[PDB]
């Protein structure tokens, strides 16, 4: 039997954050800790929420120390602020980095045996639910608002570790493209192909079943249809991307992903490479490696990505699916090689071993050897 | 902005009730009240749950007084049992009738100013969440396990009233076809076409949007694909039906239905007509009425029900959707006319006023008049 964890409540559309003050009053919460980053404060995205809270007379404090690929140190800093704030709930404003930091703070506040942070890795044996979290994404992006995962960087051990825990699921998600419009086009592109990686890896993962298949192929269709338009600055395409990224999460949270995520995590740990850019570069290479273990699923992918599949045999449709991803990466200006974003040739053996050991790698439909991964890194390295 | 309420936790597949004892221990609950009907106790369906609970040492009491189209009296009697039981949670075992009774008991128990039951009608102004509900459907299905609605019969006033409350959402749904195999074929047929009615009405409802459209069209594809096989007693078809009826609820709970539900409720109240039979008989007649107000949606319906729409103009595709529902109804042995199920011609004026005043009617893509509804009851009445 298959489990699904989802948000009990989610609001979708431009103006969705408009529902937040009423959700807070109905729940009877007294004071928020807002978990975010300095950029979101600096650009006025956090004010879009706090101005509404002030108008409704709701108490809040703020922690804005979150950095990309958030570290054990960032979690402990935000824990200290939460525990000294007297807040009874959390509001996560931002991408994967603040949302994952917020999940770690909420879990530890109600489960103090785990306050060292690294002991949360894997299926966290938590006794108690998280401090309640209201989750507000600002990237079109990670679906952290709907997943049971969070990823923290262990700086001492040079590794990203995955914490999987139904106790961390947000009580409410607010998916509001008004919070996302300020993303630079390069960030829309990187978070957009991250969402596409989620959708494609989830579609072909080993745990895949009828319900996740239906969410994944819809997510692929929405994202492939909208990403070029959203990068270009189309307001409607931005609204489509906000939904697409979420629908992908509803699936992959519950069944898993594969080798793209497994290979992208070590790049994050070694070089602080943005998650989206690493995923985007690796995706078409990993799809080519997986092609023969995906049944007819690349023909569905090719179709929803606008390839004419009427005539094509399955082998041509598989190759056309991979070429559709190459062409999308080109079109939204993702760098084509790992060397371009600060990877070292010398590191690939260590990267390959960290990828083989990464939990995400287990979901890959083709059994990955150390030797295959080494070769996959070399292929994405350069011409 | 559009809201979605869903189950936070759901288990799917034959054996899913296997997960119940672990879920209870992790939540720390001390004592269940099981809400069910005498048929489900007698047939050994409730024993599929209680034998696992007895083996794990989990305490339970039972209220088995639920009747089809549950009444104010069934709610008040169940409430009395829950209060005297010392139970701290509810397990709903059955179709829409016990699941709707269980929602009512759980709400009133934590919001005792509603113990009259009548005052719950509409958007219930409840301050507290329901007593925690674990929901186990035995039909395929009303999707009551994942909706925020419950329907009670007021005997004194000869009317079914709809209670809509996010506070009533079950904490866990267990969707296990092993709990549904014992349905007689005629019960599989009627609850199956009720699920189809949910999916088709939800697909074309005024409030419809991108996410509910994706859920509803997948539900129609699954249900139209499986129902004949399930009624005929195919094991896999039964498992597909369990999933399809649920996916239908994920959508229609959040956006609404239409005139089929509006015209079915008064038949329930006047004659105690089974909900699924009334919907099955009315569905194709209301689809024919609505056809011009559904854009290209009947082409999608016709395609996923196995009609070859490639050549067809829109008028042939719309007719093809209607005829495919008439054909499914005949194939699974649903009676074609309301006269066959105990409706009286004399009552049609009173039924039509009840239907026009029903909350579900407001969702219909075509604005219904009293005269249009009278004409629709006559058309479904006889040859
Ligand atoms: N929880 C899960 O299941 C998953 C976790 N992740 C994690 O999420 C992280 C990546 O998160 P992302 O959302 O890609 O980025 P991020 O949260 O790391 O932010 C990247 C940068 O964009 C800025 N930014 C974000 N929204 C902005 C906006 N609206 N306008 C202007 N600037 C904005 C941020 O301040 C930051 O400098 C990684 O640590 C990754 O491992 C990724 C996917 C799955
Ligand atoms: N809450 C909601 O969103 C919705 C509410 N409803 C309500 O649900 C009710 C209809 O519920 P249904 O599930 O159609 O029927 P039901 O729960 O009224 O059951 C009909 C009969 O079938 C029997 N039965 C149930 N499961 C069985 C099994 N596995 N084996 C043998 N017999 C079995 C029951 O004992 C009963 O005698 C109506 O009151 C309707 O208004 C219907 C749809 C949506
Ligand atoms: Fe990712
Ligand atoms: Fe119904």
Numbering used by the authors:
A (entry chain AAA), B (entry chain BBB): 3 to 385
Paper lines:
Here it is shown which structural adaptations were introduced by directed evolution experiments that changed the catalytic properties of the Escherichia coli (E. coli) (S)-lactaldehyde reductase [EC 1.1.1.77].
One route produced the single mutant L259V (dubbed variant D93). The mode of binding of NADH in the active site, including the nicotinamide moiety, is well defined by the electron density map, being the same in both structures.
